[PDB]
């Protein structure tokens, strides 16, 4: 009951909550477009490995473990070992940047270093240089960086200067120091840079430094580790990582696995399907995840994205920190990072390593196939779990860097793409995070893969990215991505949802980049859109029309292609579409087509005039969206027509005069926004948007189930309670009628009103009185007498309110007002004018004034008056329905709708009583007339009896009941005299009787007279369902009478 009371009826204006929601968007966080792509060009390897010579401060020897680059120099001798080690160092660096320029010095002195640095600077003056200093054979550094370089005589220590080194390499640069007291060098470096800056007031911000350990500590002398531990960690992330694992673990959990097998693990570092390949992939994923989840974005983008070598070195640095911590060394870097050895992700690494190694023995011994770990599957699972309920007010997922890695392979790509799509379906903030990690440059590569099954995923992802970030610098039209989407659109078997998203994408890239303008013609996009104009789906119709409108902007080639194929011939058929959004899209595309085609004029002036007149027909549409678009489209045509209006406007102040009349009509039409624009067009001539509303749709969630289906939401419990309340009030009204109607000598309301209360109406359930005078509507509390705010209708001066009605019982309870000039306005909150009148619409009918009767069971507005016909509009489509012809030669005072018999009920000013049957052919809907009257007929209506007998009153006062199927009457009552219409309320069996005197001669439905009741009459009315009268008087007051 509570639902059906109002939800068996159309709610005509629910769309009005969205039609005007025209908006743009906020700015985007800057920026994923990492334009700064500075790179490393050359590497200088400076070795001081003076094999066979121990500086005097060396403590020796048993645990010295003098293993360098996995070489033991004692087995080769002082010269072979040095060259061999240098070769291995070169190989270790080539694994990370094979294109680097190689430069090497073995025991250089002074001029050798100056010349090296100068030559490298000359090779690339703007790019980065890496300077790697070993120092193992050199005494502990001093504040100046003194080094044991000499002509094979140790007594020539040669003091050096960090300041001078900075001078030689003034370019952006990266320094690596393997010195014992390495931090001392960094401190001196910074102090000298400051000194130089101060001297320049009469390089600090460009250098990156990695030091093995702090200035106050020495590198460990451990018999089982390589001497060059820091270098090994930075250049060979595996190897030592596994050796450490074997040594560090207190109690091994994998019996039988030791170094003898670790050094026999097969495979290439880059062979993704081997043990080492998988381990390198996992290592990279973990170290990137830690960096993402620890550092601020300002550092993350600079260190892990701008340069391949910098990112690799810092990625390995985190490992060096973790390992060297256990030996009382603290690696030092500049810029300084927060500590990371505490992060939980390192436990995952150890687990993965443990799992791998348990298979190593048998694979070596028996040759069993290698099985892959579940690492990425579990990480994807955890992400999927997070997605269960994501909100903005939460920490972002910690695993986005893992998804990025998964997308690079061909095993879990489909799952990662699905989960990414689901993530991106959240509001715009979700997209920004995805952009900040670098999905974009990878999905651009996936866009051109040979796979076909990926189509709906790449389409969805790109639809969301473009919906949020349309600024992408033409990447989809510089490369072949646009061709992909054209093919996607072409596929006749793809679901409409994806065709719609593809059409959206194409519209965006065409209007956004101004380079896709030729490509969309090379692929015959126009032909595809024209074929697709007949698609039944509303959104494909809208977006295809938008694509065509956007194509026909400033193209010369598809000015000609447009005219050549008579594209407009098909677009105007969309002007018949029941849905106003499609009509708006069609008006946009058609107006743009002609406005731009007219630049040639030539023979196309034939088209120019015809379209102008086809648009003229749309003045009858009634929709404010279509109407506004009509005004804009006409203005676009006016731009071209002004060349001839310069000699036509003088007449206004023969298609030109028709256009003048159309624009004048549109200006006159009661939509001030439209009127204003139309007047600006008319004035401009005399003196001399929708696409964004539609576009914002795709930025919303679409996988979300709307609140309307949430059976526990407060909005449902509250609305249902209020619905029951209203129903119970109706029941109270029924009970007071059923208990018996007595003389109406009780009182409810008396208040002084503004103006003359000529129209008095009440809400079906809510005790609120709505009374109109000529110009304005006042409102009152039906029971308390409290005065409510009034609302001036806003109609032109000298107009008059003719009729008022309510449209729905509970939810869409709008107040509709009709006037003599045809204006029909609807407002949502007569109920709450104190805070927001909330105007709904402002239609105009009748192309007696205006009399209306809207059919709530059908959603139809019926109107008559000074047109001599009956007009029907579909208020659920914003479209004219029909003009109903009549043989009458006079106007009417009626009208009344009979929704159960499809009958139009009138009395006529010519004295006859005429009714119409909506089912008859529209030549004349002749059913009756009745011919027992000659004087004008006043308000008439049908009785509650199933037969459909009609009550009709003459201006002479005669009251007569007529037979619904014969021209003869049923009876004559003569209840009242003289010219008094009978307002009857069948539910209450009450008959009102107004007069020139200050009283109402109330009768019962039986015709019996009750002595005149007092609390010139202006208006008679009844509160629906209640046996209570209301009368307005020409003394500026209204009153309400009640059963005693």
């Amino acid at each position: 009951e509570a639902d059906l009371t109002d939800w068996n009826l159309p709610l005509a204006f629910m769309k009005k909550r969205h039609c005007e929601k025209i908006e743009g968007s906020k700015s985007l966080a800057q920026s994923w477009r990492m334009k700064d792509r500075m790179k490393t060009v050359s590497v200088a390897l400076v070795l001081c490995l003076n094999v066979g010579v121990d500086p005097p401060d060396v403590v020796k020897t048993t645990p010295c473990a003098r293993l360098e680059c996995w070489i033991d120099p004692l087995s080769m001798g002082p010269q072979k070992a040095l060259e061999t080690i240098g070769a291995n160092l070169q190989k270790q660096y080539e694994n990370w940047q094979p294109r680097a320029r190689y430069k090497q010095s073995l025991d250089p002195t002074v001029d050798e270093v100056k010349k090296l640095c100068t030559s490298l600077r000359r090779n690339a003056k703007e790019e980065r240089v890496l300077f790697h200093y070993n120092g193992h054979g050199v005494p502990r550094p001093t504040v100046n960086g003194e080094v044991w370089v000499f002509n094979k005589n140790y007594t020539q220590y040669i003091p050096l200067s960090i300041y001078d080194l900075q001078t030689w390499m003034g370019s952006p640069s990266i320094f690596v120091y393997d010195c014992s007291n390495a931090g001392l060098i960094v401190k001196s470096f910074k102090q000298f840079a400051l000194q130089r800056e101060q001297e320049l007031e009469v390089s600090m911000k460009n250098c990156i430094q990695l030091a093995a350990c702090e200035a106050t500590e020495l590198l460990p002398m451990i018999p089982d580790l390589p001497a060059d531990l820091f270098t090994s960690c930075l250049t060979t992330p595996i190897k030592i990582a596994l050796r450490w694992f074997c040594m560090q673990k207190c109690v091994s959990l994998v019996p039988g696995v030791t170094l003898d097998l670790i050094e026999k693990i097969p495979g290439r570092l880059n062979d993704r399907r081997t043990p080492l390949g998988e381990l390198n992939w996992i290592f990279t994923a973990i170290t990137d995840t830690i960096a993402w989840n620890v550092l601020p974005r300002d550092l993350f983008q600079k260190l892990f994205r701008q340069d391949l070598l910098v990112a690799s070195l810092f990625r390995n640095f985190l490992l060096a920190e973790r390992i060297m911590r256990s030996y009382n060394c603290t690696p030092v870097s500049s810029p300084r990072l927060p500590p990371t050895y505490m992060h939980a992700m390192w436990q995952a690494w150890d687990l993965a390593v443990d799992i791998c190694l348990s298979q190593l023995p048998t694979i070596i011994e028996e040759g069993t196939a290698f099985r892959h770990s579940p690492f990425f599957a579990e990480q994807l699972t955890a992400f999927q779990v997070w997605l269960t309920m994501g909100v903005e007010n939460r920490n972002p997922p910690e695993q986005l860097p893992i998804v990025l890695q998964v997308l690079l392979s061909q095993v879990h790509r489909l799952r990662a793409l699905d989960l990414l799509g689901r993530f991106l379906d959240l509001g715009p903030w979700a997209v920004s995070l995805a952009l900040s990690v670098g999905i974009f440059p990878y999905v651009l590569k996936l866009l051109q893969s040979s796979a076909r099954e990926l189509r709906p995923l790449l389409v969805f992802i790109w639809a969301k990215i473009l919906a949020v970030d349309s600024s992408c610098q033409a990447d989809l039209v510089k490369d072949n991505g646009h061709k992909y989407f054209l093919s996607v659109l072409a596929d006749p078997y793809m679901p409409a949802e994806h065709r719609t998203m593809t059409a959206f994408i194409l519209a965006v890239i065409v209007n956004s980049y101004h380079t896709g303008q030729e490509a969309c013609l090379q692929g015959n996009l126009i032909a595809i859109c024209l074929e697709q104009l007949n698609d039944p789906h509303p959104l494909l119709r809208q977006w295809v029309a938008i694509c065509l409108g956007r194509i026909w902007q400033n193209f010369d080639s598809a000015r000609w292609c447009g005219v050549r194929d008579s594209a407009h011939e098909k677009l105007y058929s969309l002007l018949s579409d029941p849905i106003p959004e499609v009509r708006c899209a069609a008006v946009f595309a058609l107006g743009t087509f002609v406005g731009n085609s007219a630049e040639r004029t030539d023979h196309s002036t034939t088209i120019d005039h015809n379209v102008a007149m086809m648009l003229a027909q749309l003045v009858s549409d009634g929709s404010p969206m279509v109407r506004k678009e009509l005004v804009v489209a006409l203005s676009h045509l006016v731009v071209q027509y002004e060349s001839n209006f310069c000699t036509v406007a003088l007449q206004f102040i023969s298609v030109y005069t028709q256009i003048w009349r159309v624009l004048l009509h549109l200006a006159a039409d009661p939509y001030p926004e439209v009127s204003d624009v139309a007047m600006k067009v008319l004035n401009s001539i005399a003196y001399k948007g929708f696409c964004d509303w539609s576009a914002r749709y795709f930025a919303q969630p679409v996988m979300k189930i709307p609140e309307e289906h949430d059976l526990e939401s407060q909005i449902r419990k509250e609305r249902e309670w209020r619905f029951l309340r209203n129903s119970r009030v109706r029941r109270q009204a029924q009970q007071v009628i059923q208990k018996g109607i007595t003389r109406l000598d009780d009182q409810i309301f008396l208040n002084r009103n503004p103006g003359v209360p000529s129209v008095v109406k009440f809400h079906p359930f809510t005790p609120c009185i709505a009374v109109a005078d000529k110009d304005s509507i006042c409102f009152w509390d039906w029971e308390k007498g409290e005065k409510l705010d009034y609302f001036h209708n806003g109609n032109p001066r000298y107009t008059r309110v003719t009729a008022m009605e309510y449209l729905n019982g509970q939810d869409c309870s709008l107040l509709l007002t009709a006037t003599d000039d045809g204006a029909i306005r609807v407002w949502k909150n007569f109920a709450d004018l104190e805070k927001n009148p909330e105007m709904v619409t402002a239609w105009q009918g009748l192309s007696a004034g205006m009399v209306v009767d809207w059919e709530q069971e059908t959603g139809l507005l019926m109107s008559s008056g000074d047109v001599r016909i009956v007009r029907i509009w579909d208020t659920d489509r914003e479209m004219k329905v029909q003009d109903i012809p009549t043989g009458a030669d006079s106007c009417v005072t009626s009208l009344s709708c009979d929704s159960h018999r499809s009958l139009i009920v009138a009395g006529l000013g010519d004295g006859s009583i005429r009714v119409y049957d909506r089912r008859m052919a529209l030549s004349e809907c002749r059913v009756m007339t009745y011919r027992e009257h000659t004087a004008w007929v006043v308000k008439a209506s049908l009785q509650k009896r199933p037969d459909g007998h009609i009550v009709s009153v003459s201006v002479n006062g005669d009251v007569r009941i007529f037979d619904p199927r014969m021209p003869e009457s049923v009876n004559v009552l003569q209840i009242v005299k003289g010219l008094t219409a009978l307002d009857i309320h069948p539910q209450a069996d009450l008959i009102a009787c107004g007069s020139v005197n200050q009283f109402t001669a109330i009768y019962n439905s039986s015709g019996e007279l009750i002595n005149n009741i007092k609390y010139a009459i202006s208006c008679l009315a009844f509160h629906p369902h209640w046996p209570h009268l209301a009368v307005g008087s020409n003394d500026y007051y209204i009153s309400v009478y009640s059963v005693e």
Binding site: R272, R305, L308, A311, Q405, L407, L408, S409, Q410, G438, P441, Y442, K445, L446, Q448, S449
Partner: peptide, 8 residues
């Protein structure tokens, strides 16, 4: 181009 290789 890309920092990481893709098995396109």
């Amino acid at each position: 181009e890309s920092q990481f290789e893709m098995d396109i």
